[PDB]
Amino acid sequence: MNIIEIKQLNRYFGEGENRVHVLKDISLSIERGDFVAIMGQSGSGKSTLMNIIGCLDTATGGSSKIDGKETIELTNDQLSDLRSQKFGFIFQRYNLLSSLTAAENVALPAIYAGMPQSQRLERAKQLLEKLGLGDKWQNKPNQLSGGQQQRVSIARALMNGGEIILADQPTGALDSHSGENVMEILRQLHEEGHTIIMVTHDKHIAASANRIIEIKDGEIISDTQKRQVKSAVKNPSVFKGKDQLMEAFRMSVSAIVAHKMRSLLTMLGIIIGITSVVSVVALGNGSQQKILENIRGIGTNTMTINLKISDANTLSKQSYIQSVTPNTSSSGILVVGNKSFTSANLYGIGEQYFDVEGLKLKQGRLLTEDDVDQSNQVVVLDESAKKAIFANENPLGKTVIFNKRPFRVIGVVSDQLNLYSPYSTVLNKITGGSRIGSITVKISDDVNSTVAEKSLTELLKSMNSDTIKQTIENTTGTMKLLISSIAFISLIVGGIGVMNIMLVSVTERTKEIGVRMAIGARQINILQQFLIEAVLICLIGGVAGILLSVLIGVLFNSFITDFSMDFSTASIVTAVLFSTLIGVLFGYMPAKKAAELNPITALA
Amino acid sequence: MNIIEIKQLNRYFGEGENRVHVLKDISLSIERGDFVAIMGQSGSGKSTLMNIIGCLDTATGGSSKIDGKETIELTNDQLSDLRSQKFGFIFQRYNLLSSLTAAENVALPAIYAGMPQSQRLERAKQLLEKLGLGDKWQNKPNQLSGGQQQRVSIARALMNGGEIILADQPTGALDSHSGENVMEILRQLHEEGHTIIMVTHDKHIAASANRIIEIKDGEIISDTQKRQVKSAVKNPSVFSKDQLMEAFRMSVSAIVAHKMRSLLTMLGIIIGITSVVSVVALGNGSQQKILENIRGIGTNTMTIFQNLKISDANTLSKQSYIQSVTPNTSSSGILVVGNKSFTSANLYGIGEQYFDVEGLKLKQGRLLTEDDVDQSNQVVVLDESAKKAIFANENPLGKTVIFNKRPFRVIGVVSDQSLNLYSPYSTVLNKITGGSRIGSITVKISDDVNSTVAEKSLTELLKSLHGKKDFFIMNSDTIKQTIENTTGTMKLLISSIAFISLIVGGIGVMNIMLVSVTERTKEIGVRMAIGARQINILQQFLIEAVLICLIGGVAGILLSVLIGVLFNSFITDFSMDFSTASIVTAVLFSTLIGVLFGYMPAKKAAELNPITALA
Ligand SMILES: Nc1ncnc2c1ncn2[C@@H]1O[C@H](COP(=O)(O)OP(=O)(O)OP(=O)(O)O)[C@@H](O)[C@H]1O
Ligand SMILES: Nc1ncnc2c1ncn2[C@@H]1O[C@H](COP(=O)(O)OP(=O)(O)OP(=O)(O)O)[C@@H](O)[C@H]1O
Ligand SMILES: [Mg+2]
Ligand SMILES: [Mg+2]
């Protein structure tokens, strides 16, 4: 019967007293296949009505029915179908996408309809031939005149061949010639069974119409028909209960390439929120290695203990003991030159004593295994007892006399008169007797301290100094807190860094969605390309991230001598899975809230 | 004679093959005061010529002279004057500022002309009356119909009363009534001596002109005059505190209009401060605890291992680069308690402050006082180990020992770090060994003085009072080493992560800023076309920065403060100890960068041709 049936339709804008009655109880039935012109004084409610017809706004009250189906009661996907295939909207202000070419802007409504890419551009190119723009099919909106942008918009409305053609002042910026050709086009579509509803001020234009309504002050004044109207049986209907994503992907890429700055900055914001987190964890763990090492080297942790050499032999066969020393001393008198140093000390020590006490080799060598087996008369000198006896001259080789008994100096060591000879030499050639003073062991770095104090009580029956092993465990807990709490900062920092740039750059195209929704796209078609726009830009900025920090580590480890930046593969994972799980969340959230607005509200 | 003189004017766009010849050797002299209508096909070059006349574009080649003065040779502020006072431009696409009301948009061109704000709104309101929008003077562009937007544009163009009115399809979205009223307005201004150049497609509109030019394919086909032009009297030429006081008011409204952009940018600089500051202060705090844990593992000392007098060690202690001093002298002998008789014990004859020099701390009882060393007392302080062995697990305070058949009264115990015993040096040189010569002198080097400086400062300071040898100075300073060695490592740590976190949050501001302001390069192109001078842009975009920079700065320095308080409260261990040098550095950096990236873009826009900015 009718194709559009509007009864009691009211419309308000504003808050009140800031509110205005814009469409007032207007009741309008438009007959299928008619050619209608709507005229009226500027600001009378014409564009407002056109929107509620094309399902871009929604009326405050009253019914509006397309092919008798109440519009408000349709579903959101059902509406997107109408906008793709029954309606073909020519916007007053033409509403192109600025980043797309002319042709690309025309074909866009036909991607969401789902025709092959090759078919689109040839048709889109023909529509731009019919409307005089075949010359300018590659120009973008801002490379065209207004009258050209207008015709681009006209072509788009005709791309999906919609039954109805809503045309809001579609001649406005056009000369008489270009404007007639446009009326030629619309007339022939009327002739092929299309329905035309056209707002215009030019009368010659309105003459092509068989019906002419006049609106004034939100109400409808005139209603004129030249002829009766041919009857028409309604088209079947346009309702659609994988390739969709191939297209969504292509859109997302072109979108990203179009907005090089927003994209590059966005991804550069993810790049940092990774390399910053990663570089502080790796600088932190590198300065901890050195600091703990600088502490371990200030002295060792040891356990000084019927104590014969087979005790200290089996004691050295553990992995919780890394070195051992039999001990025995002597109090006597030395001689070099005429001088005779009295009450010197000759410490009878073990193979590994200079490892057990962390004394490091200055000059020459330390007591070898041959020296302790043969009870050699060779002495390693204390740094101090070496400078005092030999002034500032090489003492290597030269001899001393402890208890009228020669000793050949073989080396020097550090500190914490002192002399170091084997225990075999002091118990054979200085004191006699087979009993030794004590046994000292160097407890490992990893094993627990108070565990071994009771693991040695057990293992021998079958005192210990450990203040380094304390201030080690004590400063590893401080370096943990430090690294841990600055990693937490740099991570919260660079997440908010992503959020900001992502929130800004996306909301900055809420009108792009509003166009996409008006031209047929379904809600889900938006989320497709805006997720793909995020992950695609997040996991390129992530890759760039993990291997920009790598390059920083190399640069650091090359020029820096003090300590090495040692990376953590846990931080890498954390920082990446965080900076993308946050960038994707804030690239989707805003695009969705837009896609679920009334297109006109999104269009402002 | 002529008010506009355009000879040989050419114009191109693009890069061949993408290049197009748009205005082709067009010569056109327009007589002062005329009413001219330009017509032609869509995309023939009409809007392009209109822009070149109104000084929004500039021709590729040829001359274009307003009042006989060549335009390209004018200065960038001389042009900005023309656009405010000679031209009144009605844009094809109406080009309103979306965040301003209808009235605010119409008055704007009168800021940069410099008229008081109370007169602007009343005139702007009147222009909207004359054009029918007095009803809607508070509506923002997106609360208006297209035709209403159009009339707001027309109103704005008539706000500075410019001599020439360039109208690019001024009636296109208007019914015939509104459209005619607009023609009525233009016609009257013509009568009042204005000059009108109007692009249109409607012919009834074109009739209200005495001169009608038709352009096609960038050339001029038609040139018609109905009546001769009324003779022309040339008009007079038209070429900071307030200026700024207004710019500030624009910047505040601008900021409030873009609440998200603003809050996020300022939140961006908030972090770029609190992050830098909270890592400098977490780092310095953990250094304090780490360096302390090291210093507390032992001291640094210089033992001067005869010719060695107590007056040497007496003068030695009177420095500020020496904190304590000890005379030394030992004894090897035999002890007795009960029936037991411990062989080869050790009795260390030591000084008043020996337990501060080696950092040994007091367990129980007391240490050797000044009375004991002055009287050569027979009192001994016991080693923790030589205390537990001799007295099992019983209080040793008071009870006696016998070193070389000579009693000694125990007075206390010590920390540690054969049997070790501590007695005064006066007691060992009088009551155990005899002789007046001592073993050595040990000094405790101060924490702040350099080590190898003092090793050569005591060689000097003691030589000055004769007594050498010995001076065979040893120096145990491996603690003093492994503090300087980890303070350099903690320096490189806090220094390089403070550099990271700083460069991090500087880019974070750049991103959000470099987007936010380029996001309004068209807003500038409008302001430039509608009168503003180059400097007028930089004014409100600097004030937009500093005003949003030093609020997010204040927010930053005191958000970090609150984090510190939270950290120092819940964490026992190292305290977050702030630096007033980082506070300054971080703030003066995150604002100098946010201001540099708020200004840079705005200034690059404001020097583009207004039309190239409008795209
Ligand atoms: N940036 C650009 N690059 C290439 N060509 C351009 C560019 N801008 C405009 N053009 C072309 O130059 C011509 C200039 O048209 P102009 O802007 O003068 O429109 P017009 O003649 O007023 O048309 P209308 O009446 O439709 O507004 C057009 O043919 C247009 O396609
Ligand atoms: N968001 C809004 N808030 C308040 N009022 C509005 C809003 N949008 C539109 N209006 C008002 O509602 C009326 C309807 O405007 P509409 O766009 O329908 O005009 P129109 O009939 O298309 O006229 P034109 O021929 O100028 O396009 C106008 O008076 C306008 O001022
Ligand atoms: Mg309209
Ligand atoms: Mg134009």
UniProtKB/Swiss-Prot annotation, chain B:
The record's annotation in Gene3D superfamilies points to: P-loop containing nucleotide triphosphate hydrolases
UniProt-listed SMART domains: AAA
**InterPro entries with a match to the protein in the record:** AAA+_ATPase (IPR003593), ABC3_permease_C (IPR003838), ABC_transporter-like_ATP-bd (IPR003439), ABC_transporter-like_CS (IPR017871), MacB-like_ATP-bd (IPR017911), MacB_PCD (IPR025857), Macrolide_Exporter_MacB (IPR050250), P-loop_NTPase (IPR027417)
Instruction: Please verify whether the record's keywords include Glycoprotein.
Output: no
- Give the residue spans that cross the bilayer: 263-283, 497-517, 547-567, 581-601
Q: EC number(s) in its UniProt entry?
A: 7.6.2.-
Q: What family is this?
A: Belongs to the ABC transporter superfamily. Macrolide exporter (TC 3.A.1.122) family.
Q: What does the function comment of this entry state?
A: Part of the tripartite efflux system MacAB-TdeA. MacB is a non-canonical ABC transporter that contains transmembrane domains (TMD), which form a pore in the inner membrane, and an ATP-binding domain (NBD), which is responsible for energy generation. Confers resistance against macrolides.
How is this protein named in the record?
Macrolide export ATP-binding/permease protein MacB
